[PDB]
Amino acid sequence: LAVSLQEALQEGDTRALREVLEEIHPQDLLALWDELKGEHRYVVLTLLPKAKAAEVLSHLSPEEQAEYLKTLPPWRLREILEELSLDDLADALQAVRKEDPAYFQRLKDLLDPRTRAEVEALARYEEDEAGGLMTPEYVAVREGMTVEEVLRFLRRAAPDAETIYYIYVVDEKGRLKGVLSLRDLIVADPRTRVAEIMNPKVVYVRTDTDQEEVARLMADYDFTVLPVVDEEGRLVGIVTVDDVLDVL
């Protein structure tokens, strides 16, 4: 699928192109990416199935990110943007914002209202602090819920969640009460309460906490996921280790 693409490209074989794009793995494409003329990068980001396109763009430089969000057709932008994880959308928007703040406003208007309001709260936080790294696509439950109710829930929430391997616990006010893992859930009795299984001394970070600290905290405790709260102690999101590895 590697060069077997530049075959469809140099040729102008749309049929063959679309076919290779249906199964080309995002990383396989991100590889030979420096070896693609400008015209070809544009066509691929156009014809690629939207989810993969979002994936690719999410891994490009922010200057490249901003250039394609400014040159790709609005119908296509609509598609790519709605496929981005929230934290990746914010970074992609902030990329454009830096260059053209007016078009940033346009990009946000192309979003679905539910999506648009979410990024807005996000895109604001300092981009080198917990808020600028986190995503609100986590799973939270109450401590009164049983394991059976949570597992049932997770199957429903899985498709959109950043992860379901770490499940946070909150109260009526939305404040962090503890942490739970999919592993514990899987071995526990379906009748067991979540409070009888959670770890009440969950370690967390603030929305303004420096990214150095988030990285250090995640390396020390060996977490793959860390919760992020606001000034009122309420769960507002999670940071995952893949995004910490990138901060280096």
Q: Binding site for Mg(2+), residues?
A: 55, 87, 91, 132, 212, 219, 222, 243, 246
Binding span for Mg ion by CB under 5 A among 31-39, 62-70, 89-97, 113-121: 89-97
Cβ count near 166 (within 10 Å): 21
Among 55, 67, 79, 87, binds Mg ion (CB under 5 A): 87
Q: For residue 158, which of 178, 138, 144 has the smallest C-alpha distance?
A: 138
* 237 Rama sector, left if φ>0, alpha if ψ -120 to 50, beta otherwise: left
The structure tokens 């156009």 sit at 46
Helix (H, G, I), strand (E, B) or coil at 58: helix
Q: How many residues does the chain have?
A: 248
Verify binding: residue 25, its own copies, rule CB under 8 A. yes
| Residue stretches of the annotated binding site for ATP | 166, 181, 183-184, 203
Report in angstroms how near the CB of residue 14 gets to Mg ion at its nearest.
33
Cβ 206 vs Cβ 234: under 8 Å: no
Cβ 103 vs Cβ 96: under 8 Å: yes
The 39-78 contact track toward its own copies, x by CB under 8 A, reads --------------------x-------------------
Verify binding: residue 132, Mg ion, rule CB under 5 A. yes
Among 55, 91, 118, 129, binds Mg ion (CB under 5 A): 91
210 φ/ψ angles, rounded to the nearest 5 degrees: -60, 145
Enumerate binding residues for its own copies (CB under 8 A): 25, 27, 30, 59, 151, 154-155, 158-159, 163-165, 182-183, 186-187, 201, 203, 218-224, 241-242, 244-246
Enumerate binding residues for Mg ion (CB under 5 A): 87, 90-91, 132, 243
